[PDB]
């Protein structure tokens, strides 16, 4: 009839997209399951158009290829878009109104007993662009749309046709075809989820595992975890790139001659390091984030005193609060302290430890070189994007620099300041949560601008002053031997007991002293000079 009696969808390749399959099955072929008599008794018409769209390389063409064989359908007629056009006058419109002849004939012959004929138009946006483009030339690019629309709308009661159109850019499709009665249902295919990536990895490595060609060491769960934003095509590319390494240990291409070890050919086996190297080669094209924050804390933590622990605990308390309660849908925090004490690192550490689904960081590095309007659009888009997922953390770094503050005018950009002021107070749509954490070093300037009323709580980050903390960081940095680390601290105790430096400057001085002369005469000289 319409679905084969022997089919369960478990065999078919497509994996990771199950909800979309159910939606398509429910809204497309459901009405053609019962005997016809019910439908007219219920006063419901059949659906005629189906549209699939998504980013490049998500699996739509695979669905189109396998649907015909999977669901006992008549061999679908497949035509690439730009193959319709032709040279002689009137040839193209004929070519379009030559595909539907079989359906018309079968309908006329057998009434409602006619089977289902399906034709799918690959690259739909190729020919059916906007029919008001203009150009003052050959109009064969317009009568094509008119012919298809005439045979799809003024069908003369053809109710046994389903057209499927797959595209990558919906915006370019002519709006006239997006209306009831013509391509009604639109299904979006997006990037897979973690469980879908495990399914894709299993499907891709099925045959490799079956023939004992994969070493037992490999663990698919770890790989699924590592590939943060890989689509299906990139996963397949990763698989074969990793296999290339294993291939290239017996056959040495270039070096020497062709030396094929006929014995290791039977022992060919992939391993984990090959997969890690393949991860090194292939890169995703989506990215967004989860790398800038990691590099922002590259130097790592040191726990040189209790203040770090207390601040981290407070951050944990706030993340717990935003995670549990349903009445607190917005929390904002300020992190302020002397310059160079280390603030962005602390915020990035808390955000990474939180483990929320959505995380991002706004810093002057990204915005550099843009025009003011571009900066405003970028900030607005980033906020709007953050308003999407159920839980969200957003970090704002060095507020004063985002506004171009220089104390000679004083000159600053008022538009950006006002946008940030209004945005930091906007609660997200219903049943969503946000945690904003912004850091600054010019507390007084923020006080003067009178934007201090939009922050719920403030956290100070005093720099270190006790020689014990200096000794701790020294031992953690492995600057010198134990005797030298003791001697430097005893000398500095009497050289300059009072101490106010920071953290960044300490590491910089440590490295410069390592390079030139690890003895006192350089490290202690610089340390005293800075303070």
């Amino acid at each position: 009839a319409v679905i084969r009696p022997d089919f369960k969808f478990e065999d078919l390749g497509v994996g990771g997209l199950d909800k979309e399959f159910t939606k398509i099955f429910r809204r497309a072929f459901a009405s053609r399951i019962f005997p016809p008599s019910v439908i007219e008794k219920l006063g419901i018409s059949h659906v005629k158009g189906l549209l699939l769209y998504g980013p490049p390389g998500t699996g739509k063409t695979l669905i189109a290829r396998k649907i015909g064989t999977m669901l006992n359908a008549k061999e679908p007629k497949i035509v690439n878009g730009p193959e319709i056009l032709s040279k002689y006058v009137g040839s193209s419109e004929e070519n379009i109104r030559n595909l539907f002849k079989d359906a018309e004939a079968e309908y006329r012959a057998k009434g409602e007993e006619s089977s289902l004929h399906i034709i799918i138009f690959d690259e739909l946006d190729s020919v059916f662009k906007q029919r008001g483009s203009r150009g003052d030339g050959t109009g064969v690019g317009d009568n094509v749309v008119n012919q298809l629309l005439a045979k799809m709308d003024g069908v003369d009661q053809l109710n046994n046709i389903l057209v499927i159109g797959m595209t990558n850019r919906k915006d370019l499709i002519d709006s006239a075809l997006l209306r009831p009665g013509r391509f009604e249902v639109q299904v979006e295919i997006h990037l897979p989820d973690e469980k879908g990536r495990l399914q894709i990895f299993d499907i891709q490595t099925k045959k490799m595992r079956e023939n004992n060609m994969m070493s037992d060491d490999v663990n698919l769960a770890e790989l699924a975890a590592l590939t943060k934003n890989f689509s299906g095509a990139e996963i397949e590319g990763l698989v074969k790139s990793a296999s290339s390494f294993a291939i290239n240990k017996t056959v040495n291409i270039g070096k020497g001659a062709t030396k094929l070890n006929t014995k290791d050919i039977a022992k060919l086996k992939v391993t984990r390091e090959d997969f890690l190297n393949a991860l090194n080669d292939v890169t995703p094209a989506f990215g967004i984030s989860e790398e800038d924050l990691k590099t922002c804390v590259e130097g790592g933590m040191m726990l040189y005193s209790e203040r770090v622990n207390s601040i981290l605990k407070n951050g944990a308390r706030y993340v717990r609060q935003v995670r549990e309660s349903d009445k607190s849908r917005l929390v904002s925090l300020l992190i302020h302290g002397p310059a160079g004490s280390g603030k962005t690192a602390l915020a990035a550490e808390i955000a990474l430890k939180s483990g929320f689904p959505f995380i991002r960081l706004i810093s002057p590095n990204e915005l550099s070189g843009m025009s003011e309007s571009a900066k405003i659009a970028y900030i607005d888009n980033t906020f709007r994007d953050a308003y999407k997922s159920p839980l969200n953390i957003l970090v704002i770094d060095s507020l004063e620099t985002l506004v171009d503050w220089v104390p000679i005018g004083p000159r600053f950009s008022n538009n950006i300041l006002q946008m940030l002021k209004v945005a930091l107070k906007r609660k997200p749509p219903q049943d969503r949560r946000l945690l904003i954490m912004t850091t600054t070093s010019a507390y007084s300037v923020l006080q003067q601008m009178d934007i201090l009323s939009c922050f719920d709580n403030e956290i100070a980050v005093p720099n270190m002053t006790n020689l014990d903390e200096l000794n701790n960081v020294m031992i953690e940095s492995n600057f010198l031997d134990d005797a030298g680390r003791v001697k430097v601290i005893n000398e500095l105790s009497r050289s300059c007991p009072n101490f106010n430096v920071g953290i960044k400057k300490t590491l910089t001085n440590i490295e410069t002293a390592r390079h030139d002369e690890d003895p006192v005469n350089e490290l202690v000289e610089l340390m005293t000079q800075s303070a």
Binding site: G137, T138, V140
Partner: peptide, 12 residues
């Protein structure tokens, strides 16, 4: 400040 090209169809 615009210009335009031109294409050609053969005879039916």
């Amino acid at each position: 400040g615009q210009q335009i090209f031109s294409q050609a169809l053969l005879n039916a």
